[PDB]
Amino acid sequence: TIPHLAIDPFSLDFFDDPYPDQQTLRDAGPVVYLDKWNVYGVARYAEVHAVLNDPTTFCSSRGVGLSDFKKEKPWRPPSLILEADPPAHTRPRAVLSKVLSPATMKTIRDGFAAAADAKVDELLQRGCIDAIADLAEAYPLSVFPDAMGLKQEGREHLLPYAGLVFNAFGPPNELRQTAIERSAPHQAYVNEQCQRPNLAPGGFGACIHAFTDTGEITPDEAPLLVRSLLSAGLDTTVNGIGAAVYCLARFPGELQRLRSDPTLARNAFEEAVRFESPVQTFFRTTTREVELGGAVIGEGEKVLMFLGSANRDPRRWSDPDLYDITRKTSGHVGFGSGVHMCVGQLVARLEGEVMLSALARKVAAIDIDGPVKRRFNNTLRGLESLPVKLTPA
Ligand code: HEM
Ligand SMILES: [Cl-]
């Protein structure tokens, strides 16, 4: 028998304080039934991690949101990559993997680091900044669209585009309804920047499009792959970075450790990703009857994975509720795991690294000073505003 719970993990109350209810999702049993949305979920590390690693049994091609693409109409034409199963996923995955290769990262590290240092310098002149608008938002908007090869005009549509994409994986609540009602201009902006003549030479977009010349992909597939990175590749990194700064604001000890060995920057970032888990949840759909956590679940059933919970499971993590910048963070699910593991993880790490490295060197203290405000989203977890005073080194 599977435990029934009344917890609504897509509700404003849940978002505002998820941690008690997350314990209850874990502690009820390895598999629970969410009364509210009529679906099964798993919130322990072990089940979440095992579900990721068996795409044959737990498919994505039926949507990674509540909606089941076999029975219901997708809100937009499905992602080629996020919403496909091997073998179909493989070709496009390989395409995005080359575009975002370690080697590509080497070519862009220095520019990214330069901006990250310039950015921090600038903020110290001001003293009082908002770590979201001025830092977690400004910094990635300052490097990632250029790196994509996007034109100046229309950029304002990127963050709201992401929000919509991420609201849409959820149940049909007001967050979701409202996002879709207001989708058209964002979609029209992105559909236009996905086109070849609009991506600057040598940027991710053009680089994507080059795969059409070799036959690696069709002229039609290219824009839809550009659309993938315009969906997933900004807002996550905004929330990951905001997580990191939020953490070092709350954990002064850890900041001094980081100041003390700036080479901890990359791992300090990884640890914020675990701890806050920017992307909180994703679904899968069973392709057969399957035993998971000791319960038998039938074919064609949606299963909710609580990535952020898994990342806080005391079964897997020593002292899960602590931000610890030397934690062996290897194994966390914040980026997913297995075939679909975040193909953009290296851009994200690069942003996080250099930002935390610049904060490491240039800043001696980071204090919260003001109302912290949360941003509600069906999938993404993060802040709207985090007012901080930065003390210079
Ligand atoms: C802190 C930042 C980020 C986080 C936490 C994050 C999180 C994730 C997670 C959890 C998955 C797994 C999806 C699944 O299993 O169904 C994923 C996949 C994906 N990510 Fe990210 N991501 C981040 C940044 C980025 C960036 C910078 C890009 C691109 C530039 C990106 C693009 C993608 C794409 C295209 C997929 C689909 C991969 C596939 O299905 O093979 N993400 N991401
Ligand atoms: Cl779209």
TrEMBL record:
UniProt keyword annotations, A-Z: Heme, Iron, Metal-binding, Monooxygenase, Oxidoreductase
Superkingdom of origin: Bacteria
Cofactor(s) this protein requires: heme
GO molecular function: heme binding; iron ion binding; monooxygenase activity; oxidoreductase activity, acting on paired donors, with incorporation or reduction of molecular oxygen
Keyword rRNA-binding set for record: no
Residues that bind heme b: 89, 93, 284, 340, 342
Keyword Iron part of the UniProt annotation: yes
Similarity-based family: Belongs to the cytochrome P450 family.
Identification of the protein by name: Cytochrome P450
